[PDB]
Amino acid sequence: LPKMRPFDRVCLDIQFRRPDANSIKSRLMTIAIREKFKLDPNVIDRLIQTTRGDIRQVINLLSTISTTTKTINHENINEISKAWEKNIALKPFDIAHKMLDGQIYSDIGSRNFTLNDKIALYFDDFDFTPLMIQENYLSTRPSVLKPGQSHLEAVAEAANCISLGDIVEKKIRSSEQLWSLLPLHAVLSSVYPASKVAGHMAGRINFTAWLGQNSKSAKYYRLLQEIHYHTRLGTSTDKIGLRLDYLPTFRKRLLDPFLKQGADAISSVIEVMDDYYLTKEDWDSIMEFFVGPDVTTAIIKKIPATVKSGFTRKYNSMTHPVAIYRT
Amino acid sequence: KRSKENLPWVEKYRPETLDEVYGQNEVITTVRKFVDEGKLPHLLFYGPPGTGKTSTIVALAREIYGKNYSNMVLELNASDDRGIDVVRNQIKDFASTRQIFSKGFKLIILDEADAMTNAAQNALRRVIERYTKNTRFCVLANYAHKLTPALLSRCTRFRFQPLPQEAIERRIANVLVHEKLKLSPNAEKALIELSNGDMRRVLNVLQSCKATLDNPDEDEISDDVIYECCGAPRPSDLKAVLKSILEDDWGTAHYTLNKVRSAKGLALIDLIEGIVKILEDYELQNEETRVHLLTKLADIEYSISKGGNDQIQGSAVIGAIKASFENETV
Amino acid sequence: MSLWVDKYRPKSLNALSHNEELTNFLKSLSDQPRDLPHLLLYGPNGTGKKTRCMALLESIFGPGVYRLKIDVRQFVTASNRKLELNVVSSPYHLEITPSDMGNNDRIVIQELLKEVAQMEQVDFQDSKDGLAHRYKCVIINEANSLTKDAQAALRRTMEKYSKNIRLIMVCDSMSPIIAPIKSRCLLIRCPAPSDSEISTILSDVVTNERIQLETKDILKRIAQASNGNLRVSLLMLESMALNNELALKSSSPIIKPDWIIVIHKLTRKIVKERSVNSLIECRAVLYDLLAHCIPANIILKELTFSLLDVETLNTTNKSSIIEYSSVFDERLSLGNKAIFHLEGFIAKVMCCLD
Amino acid sequence: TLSLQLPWVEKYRPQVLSDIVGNKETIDRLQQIAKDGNMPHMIISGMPGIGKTTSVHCLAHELLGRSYADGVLELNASDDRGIDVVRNQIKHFAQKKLHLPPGKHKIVILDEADSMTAGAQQALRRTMELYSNSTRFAFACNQSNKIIEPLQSRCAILRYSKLSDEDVLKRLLQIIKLEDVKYTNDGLEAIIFTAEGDMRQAINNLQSTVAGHGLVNADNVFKIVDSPHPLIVKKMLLASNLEDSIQILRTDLWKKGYSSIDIVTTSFRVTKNLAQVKESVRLEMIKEIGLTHMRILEGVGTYLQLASMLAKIHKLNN
Amino acid sequence: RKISKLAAEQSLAQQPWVEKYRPKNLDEVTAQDHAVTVLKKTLKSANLPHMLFYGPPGTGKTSTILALTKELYGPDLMKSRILELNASDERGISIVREKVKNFARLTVSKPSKHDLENYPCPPYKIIILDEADSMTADAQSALRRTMETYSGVTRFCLICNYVTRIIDPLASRCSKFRFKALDASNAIDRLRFISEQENVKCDDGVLERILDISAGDLRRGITLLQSASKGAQYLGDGKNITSTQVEELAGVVPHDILIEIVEKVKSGDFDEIKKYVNTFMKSGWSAASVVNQLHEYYITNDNFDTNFKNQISWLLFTTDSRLNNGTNEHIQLLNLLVKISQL
DNA sequence: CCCCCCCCCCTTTTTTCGGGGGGGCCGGGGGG
DNA sequence: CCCCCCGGCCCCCCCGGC
DNA sequence: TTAGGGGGGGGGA
Ligand SMILES: Nc1ncnc2c1ncn2[C@@H]1O[C@H](COP(=O)(O)OP(=O)(O)OP(O)(O)=S)[C@@H](O)[C@H]1O
Ligand SMILES: Nc1ncnc2c1ncn2[C@@H]1O[C@H](COP(=O)(O)OP(=O)(O)OP(O)(O)=S)[C@@H](O)[C@H]1O
Ligand SMILES: Nc1ncnc2c1ncn2[C@@H]1O[C@H](COP(=O)(O)OP(=O)(O)OP(O)(O)=S)[C@@H](O)[C@H]1O
Ligand SMILES: Nc1ncnc2c1ncn2[C@@H]1O[C@H](COP(=O)(O)OP(=O)(O)O)[C@@H](O)[C@H]1O
Ligand SMILES: [Mg+2]
Ligand SMILES: [Mg+2]
Ligand SMILES: [Mg+2]
């Protein structure tokens, strides 16, 4: 859980897993012979599966049933299991696995696992289910393709419905707070798109990558804003124009010279930086924006360490202008 | 608040007794029988705007208690705070305490309960049950989907229908007698047609019409006055526009629509609604015509609701009608 | 030093060199600026809208408009969050970009603009007429990015306090602007400069910067590749001069932005391979582009217009591509997560092409 | 008149476990527990108006007798049930010293426990375990899934199902015999049909019909209880021709005063559970209904929008 | 330093023409008689109802309500009798429950003898909720009983551009007034008066062309007239304003460019259309104006059949609806032109 | 003993208004 | 004159369909 | 029908 994040690497992590049937069979038999009721050993596994490994729940079930039903056997195991079946909400990975299974979308599966059940499965975690579906709807071998329909067509329909669900989600979380639309979102984001590509997972279920990418985008946008407002007094443009037009040109006057003139370009680069009230951190942030063929990590690393040390020494041994005076 | 004559007609003519509520004979008779026999249950009044729910409950409270009913009934509405805390303290003490003035039972009127939070509705569940021996609850609603099933299960439901024509005519006659006004038969028909079963609309339109007459004493309200004050299309305009669209060419239809709309500054939405109403009575050979008409006109209305270009919307209406009616041949 | 795009920017209305009719109209507006209405300047990006706005302000008030300072203003939301807005101000005007605060931009309209408008001008700012100025100018950059709530909040402010503030909003497209706001502004179209004018400006820059041009055809090629974007043209001329030792030859290649190269590679990948694995791979490219401050709308526009330029596609494919582009542009305008709509558009294009 | 007749739901509320209809096995288990004692922690879940609170109160009374006043702590949604209340009042009640019969324990009743906050539920966990030797907990709820898993692990589960028409008829006939109500078979059938398995609703409708019309027949019953609108919506959605669906919409729903939002919400709910129709067709219908609902929520709640929705639904099935 | 305060008349004399010529009394409203007469009769009836003014932009709703308040209460008593809340003020449910309700419950301010002798002074106050369509549904519902319970001392005026955004109960509680669009047939007199008072010299039909271009918005027409007057004065040539200058100032595409676009569409070649549109967007023409002009050209052309017009009407409607959502103009215009070329 | 099989359990985290709950200072009052 | 008590703003986190 | 991969623990040639 996020709230347990602080405990990441400060304690010895010990895990207790669901007890197996054999380890508790003897204790259950002892309790049964002590409490003076008849239980068939063969139905023990069914009871342990009913409670999902909860020994306390198993003992409570025994105590409750033994009040009137003095015999636990195959003649009544089904009813007991159904009545005392724990209803535990699935986790994102399990929700994604079950939603993207073609069996539940067949006629028999649909009559067994109904549309209401599918919608309820979404409500187990409504904040992560659409993200998991969007992440894992392209990694399946479908088993529900209509005759004459290819996998790509179903993928396109699912993507269109996902876009519509995104529009609905934007509507829900607005000032109007139209939460009554939540069920419709469930259909538009998880159920319908899954029904188009439902099948067998073609790999491993991955966690949504949209969250980390959004965080990275936010960080880069913050850096771009800081740089734009540092260079605002010298450039006539906005942040988008700065990123798309100005930065590539600045690349040829801030990093490229060091690759040609070696350590003799420090003066010119510092002069250019001062002309735009740019700092060393601004330099580093600028050099991280370029993408594709203009990636600079290797380029900057290949620069001799002496050149970088001299650049830092020269920058730190001078008085540079200030653009924004915080007071 | 100098006098009741300074109030708007919607508030000046608010019923004070159950005999002045029209168009709800079944509900009024049943509630009167319940009150007379002392068998009033928990009540729910579900209905559309301006049907007489608040007036009916206020009249019932006044009949049960009298002139001082306001000090004997706990009335709450959306304008007031009705959170779980209020339910836990104010309503609970009101229901569990005796009346200060008389020795009778206690009434709680939760008007506009559809705006109440789910937590407060859940809290009211046991309040309604525990103090049922001496307290009664009335819940007024316009939307039943906002009421929890548990609250609905504890109340007896009464549906307020849209006002019938006869009740509106009787109330109009009473208003005319009070105001010393003359209304034409066609004017009355037009006024009832545009009301959609809402008495507040009728009263507001009549008040506007009275202000339009140069001499309200010696002048009579005609259909022309009603159409002009509301700025609504006349039936003749709708018929002419539809006929031009259905039988004339594109240029003639466009000219007719623009001319009809510019003579009195008619609104496109009103014309669309009138044409839809007219076409609803048409006997069409193919269902495709009806499907296309309904879908395209609904889309045009939705687009108009957000603004857009009026000329393009009118051309779209004309083209949609013309294309939809082309399915009646083959 | 300062880039040529910034070193040679005009600082007056008489220094303008393209769209002489627009210059004449602006001069006519500045002749009697006391009754100047609110202005909305719309046109293609990179044409000189901001330069002309600054020139108009200089003509109305004088050169002092170019003495700029930057301050920070604090705001508190309903959730107690603290937001910072960078305000660029001069002795005569104030520049703001409310979209920096996203959905909170409304507050900037509600508090800062209201405070400025509810204050009359008391400093003796003597004008050309002999009497002091009575209003302060406010420049709302990127007005097209304002949320509808902020625009609604702007409505009554411009009317009640028109005697203390005059608004100049610069936008690239008027489609996102609500009709009530457009009704309250004088709309000024700003056409992009012609190729000949761009070539003249570039030749002037070359002459001032002592650049050896093998021929004047290079300037024409640069202007044609800029598609009317003067900022891009000047920055490309500077870029092309720093890669050829300050000497431009007829064989000098035109340098494209890195994101443009990535988008062209994506277009070629989409055209060549139409498969689910190809879509999965293209998702990585889309995420990578979106994570480096490349707007989704720009990505969609460039992808659509690069796919339409492929010579191996037929008319039906291009028609389907443009229809899907329109639909998914509407979806992007009405959505939050751009990657969803972009992936849907790419999937539909792949389906149609295959 | 300033007098009120006691509702039959309270006048005839069961006071012993033997007077509760439906869920025979669960009620028998409750009687067995009341006989032997050693009542365990339990959670009773089910749909409203089926006899959960009545069963809990009857069990508590049959178990505690004259000690009910001191041995029962009852809390519901109308009372404060925050974390502070759990940590102070419930703890004090559990720690209280009370001499009870040999095989009896104190009872804490938490009616409508599904409305409690997660903090209070978490706090109750150790209180239940440390004082189980003297106190036992009985929760009553409608949605058992809202109870945290740790609490469910410590309590038995008693799920209540809908009352069959036979049980409702039995109880209604008993009340009629105890009230000398004149009735007709069709009237009782209509009462059961409109009740939909809810005993409280059935009893309230019967009392209202008796007090308003006297004779309990189909006509009088339907004058008090209106036809369920979900069934009318289902008929509208299952109509063959578009004209029939539009007629149902206009005559039975729109002209009766039903709001557009209610109509669209009911249409969505009915379509979600229309097993006769294939799942894909229901999904397309749900998409269309969601578009119509979004249009309505924006302010356009016109009859034309509902007509267009019906036309689109019919086009989907063609 | 400090500057001497200006007089109200002097300040107004240097304001934009839209604010300078705002109606001062109910008689200055041009083409809203159907509602202005009803509002004027209330100055003697003294039974003003709850009002809901709705209509397109620039029709005179705010001006009408301000004039009504000024006539009812006068310059001095107006401030204590009017509570104005607009989109620039916080209008949540809490504000409605506390601020609006508290103001409504307050006793009416005591009129002075001069006010009673010179103005009707109705015995109630007015709450004006401008741009009420921006308020949430819950806040609107919170007003339902406040409107009715305290109607004796308070009246409510809701002004909106989209009537559908007002919840049904509030619309039912309010008497509705629709403000009609101002065109060349009902607003020519006001524009002519404004031009005459400003010594603006224009050729015949210039004012009508301005009003037709405005498309129901008188504020836009007045602003365009002011711009034309400023241009003419700057030129200082003494000649009359012409319709071509007005069209150039209004952003109307020249007819020749429209004919070129039509010819390109007729050709049907995708590449040529794409190239021409790419060149066209460089001029900054607004897509909405281009679509409107294309609609005017095609729908009113006799050289096209019925099916073509039926299809083009829906195409134009779809393009306009998509543009109204704030979409890229280039893509939408190219799609529309390509679709028309294939009809 | 390493090897085999089976079973269980882990991959990982963004946000527009309104209401309700829970914790923490603060300040008014009473009292010694 | 100063300490204890205990009600009253402020603040921050968590839901939101059925 | 078991998403892939790692951790636990009873059985055993
Ligand atoms: N049945 C009726 N008979 C006579 N006048 C009526 C009737 N119903 C409504 N009216 C008129 O409409 C006014 C408002 O009636 P209300 O009962 O307050 O409206 P409503 O039914 O409560 O609508 P909602 O649900 O509150 S939006 C009354 O003061 C009457 O003038
Ligand atoms: N099984 C039943 N047998 C007899 N009467 C019943 C039965 N169930 C309900 N009733 C009657 O309906 C009334 C209300 O039932 P309750 O059990 O108190 O409500 P409920 O079942 O708790 O519904 P919720 O979930 O609390 S809203 C009782 O007082 C009885 O009169
Ligand atoms: N009916 C009219 N008569 C005279 N001038 C008018 C009229 N309508 C608009 N105007 C002019 O337009 C200006 C603005 O009018 P407003 O009433 O503020 O616009 P509006 O009707 O409120 O549009 P919205 O809904 O606020 S966008 C006025 O100051 C007048 O100069
Ligand atoms: N009249 C002109 N003469 C020379 N250069 C110009 C002129 N107008 C604009 N520019 C150049 O074009 C570049 C971009 O202009 P910009 O102000 O960004 O226009 P917009 O505001 O439309 O984006 C500026 O850096 C400026 O140097
Ligand atoms: Mg009411
Ligand atoms: Mg109970
Ligand atoms: Mg206005």
Numbering used by the authors:
A (entry chain A): 460 to 786
B (entry chain C): 7 to 336
C (entry chain E): 1 to 354
D (entry chain B): 4 to 321
E (entry chain D): 11 to 353
Question: What does the literature reporting this entry say, word for word?
Answer:
The DNA sliding clamp proliferating cell nuclear antigen (PCNA) is an essential co-factor for many eukaryotic DNA metabolic enzymes. PCNA is loaded around DNA by the ATP-dependent clamp loader replication factor C (RFC), which acts at single-stranded (ss)/double-stranded DNA (dsDNA) junctions harboring a recessed 3’ end (3’ ss/dsDNA junctions) and at DNA nicks. RFC is composed of four small AAA+ subunits, Rfc2-5, and one large AAA+ subunit, Rfc1, which assemble head-to-tail into a two-tiered partially open ring structure. To illuminate the loading mechanism we have investigated the structure of RFC:PCNA bound to ATPγS and 3’ ss/dsDNA junctions or nicked DNA using cryogenic electron microscopy.
RFC has been demonstrated to load PCNA at DNA nicks in vitro, which is relevant for RFC-PCNA function in DNA repair. We therefore hypothesized that RFC can bind and load PCNA at nicked DNA by binding one of the double-stranded segments to site 1 and the second segment to site 3. To visualize PCNA loading at DNA nicks, we assembled and collected cryo-EM images of RFC:PCNA in complex with a 50 base-pair nicked dsDNA substrate. Image analysis revealed open and closed states at resolutions from 2.4 to 2.7 Å. Among these classes were open and closed states in which the nicked DNA was coordinated with one double-stranded segment in the central chamber at site 1 and the second double-stranded segment between the AAA+ and collar domains at site 3 connected by a single-stranded region. These double-stranded segments are coordinated by Rfc1 in an identical fashion to how it coordinates 3’ ss/dsDNA junctions in sites 1 and 3 with Trp582 and Gln636 binding to the last paired bases of the double-stranded region of the nicked DNA that occupies site 1 and Phe552, His556, and Ile664 binding the last bases of the double-stranded region of the nicked DNA that occupies site 3. Moreover, both double-stranded regions of nicked DNA are melted and the 3’ and 5’ overhangs bind to the same residues of RFC as do the 3’ and 5’ overhangs of the 3’ ss/dsDNA junctions that bind to RFC at sites 1 and 3, respectively. The 5-base single-stranded segment of the nicked DNA connecting the two double-stranded regions is coordinated by interactions with Phe552, Phe587, Arg632, Phe666, Trp669, and Leu670. Thus, RFC employs the same mechanism to load PCNA onto nicked DNA and 3’ ss/dsDNA junctions. Through either pathway, RFC-PCNA will be bound to both the 3’ and 5’ junction of a DNA nick, as observed in our structural analysis here.
